[PDB]
Enzyme design. Structure first.
Site, PDB file in Angstrom:
ATOM      1  N   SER A  47     -90.624 -17.737 -61.815  1.00  0.00           N
ATOM      2  CA  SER A  47     -89.445 -18.209 -61.930  1.00  0.00           C
ATOM      3  C   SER A  47     -88.354 -17.273 -60.851  1.00  0.00           C
ATOM      4  O   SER A  47     -87.126 -17.778 -60.505  1.00  0.00           O
ATOM      5  CB  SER A  47     -88.785 -18.207 -63.047  1.00  0.00           C
ATOM      6  OG  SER A  47     -89.339 -19.160 -63.886  1.00  0.00           O
ATOM      7  N   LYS A  50     -87.022 -19.212 -58.155  1.00  0.00           N
ATOM      8  CA  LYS A  50     -86.008 -20.270 -57.996  1.00  0.00           C
ATOM      9  C   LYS A  50     -84.816 -19.765 -57.032  1.00  0.00           C
ATOM     10  O   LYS A  50     -83.830 -20.437 -56.599  1.00  0.00           O
ATOM     11  CB  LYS A  50     -85.386 -20.265 -59.545  1.00  0.00           C
ATOM     12  CG  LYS A  50     -86.248 -20.935 -60.297  1.00  0.00           C
ATOM     13  CD  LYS A  50     -85.811 -21.266 -61.873  1.00  0.00           C
ATOM     14  CE  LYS A  50     -86.753 -22.225 -62.634  1.00  0.00           C
ATOM     15  NZ  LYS A  50     -87.789 -21.482 -62.896  1.00  0.00           N
TER      16      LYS A  50
END
Ligand SMILES: C=C(C(=O)O)[C@@H](C)[C@H]1OB(O)c2cccc(F)c21
Length: 242
Positions: A47, A50
């Protein structure tokens, strides 16, 4: 230019953990880490991707601004905060994978690859599914490479608009008080071994900025809070935060 400080291993050992913290003193252009080898080992970004994904989505108009709502698709997922509408701020905060998977599909593989090359991001390899390569495809990035990328973002030097960079830096806001500001993103790579946790970002002080990137072995989700805890012990030891 690089210093190894093995004393930071104690923060790792006191939690029966193993990993690396990398720090970069922007004013002095000097880096420090507890493990020079692991600092340069390239892992799936999970992540933490992101960050680049947000930038690309904003610059290509997939995301109009930080208030645009991405409505839940109605599929109930394991993580309860994901089962609701999100904007860019809350999608970053709650690390809402399905929102970013749709961003990636709308970006498409050609534009995603070209942007990661322009960003000099890790090994620049998006092989895998366009909507999951940062979880189980070919993209690999080391802690020092994350710092290189974050420094460009801090100074608005990535090859996207100033506005896109400002909006992502807003969305990275994690902690602030009268001493420091942390802008950062967590990551948890579970699909491909070795399972690891990440925290990458920077600490803003009055007169300097300290970039950081850490990863650690993460055999279970029980230890996710150690990503921030161990990093903060290092920052405290180095007198970056009280
Ligand atoms: C909240 C998270 C975090 O703080 O890391 C994790 C659980 C979330 O963010 B990603 O790193 C990711 C990747 C796949 C699945 C997934 F639930 C996540």
């Amino acid at each position: 230019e690089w210093q190894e400080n093995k004393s930071w291993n104690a923060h790792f050992t006191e939690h029966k953990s193993q990993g690396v913290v990398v720090l970069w003193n922007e004013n002095k252009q000097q880096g420090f880490t507890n493990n020079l080898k692991r600092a340069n080992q390239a892992f799936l970004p999970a992540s933490t991707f992101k960050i680049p994904n947000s930038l690309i989505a904003l610059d290509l108009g997939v995301v109009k601004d930080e208030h645009q709502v991405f409505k839940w698709d109605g599929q109930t997922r394991d993580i309860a905060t994901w089962n609701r509408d999100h904007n860019l701020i809350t999608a970053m905060k709650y690390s809402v994978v399905p929102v970013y998977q749709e961003f990636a599909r709308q970006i498409g593989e050609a534009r995603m690859s070209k942007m990661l090359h322009a960003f000099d991001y890790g090994n620049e390899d998006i092989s895998g599914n366009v909507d999951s390569f940062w979880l189980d495809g070919g993209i690999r990035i080391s802690a020092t490479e994350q710092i290189s990328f974050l420094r460009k973002l801090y100074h608005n030097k990535l090859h996207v608009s100033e506005r896109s960079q400002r909006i992502v830096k807003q969305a990275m806001l994690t902690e602030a008080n009268g001493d420091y500001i942390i802008r950062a993103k967590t990551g948890y790579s579970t699909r491909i071994e070795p399972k690891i946790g990440w925290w990458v970002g920077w600490v803003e002080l009055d007169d300097n900025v300290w970039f950081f990137a850490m990863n650690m072995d993460m055999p279970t989700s029980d230890g996710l809070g150690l990503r921030q805890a161990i990093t903060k012990e290092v920052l405290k030891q180095e007198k970056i935060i009280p």
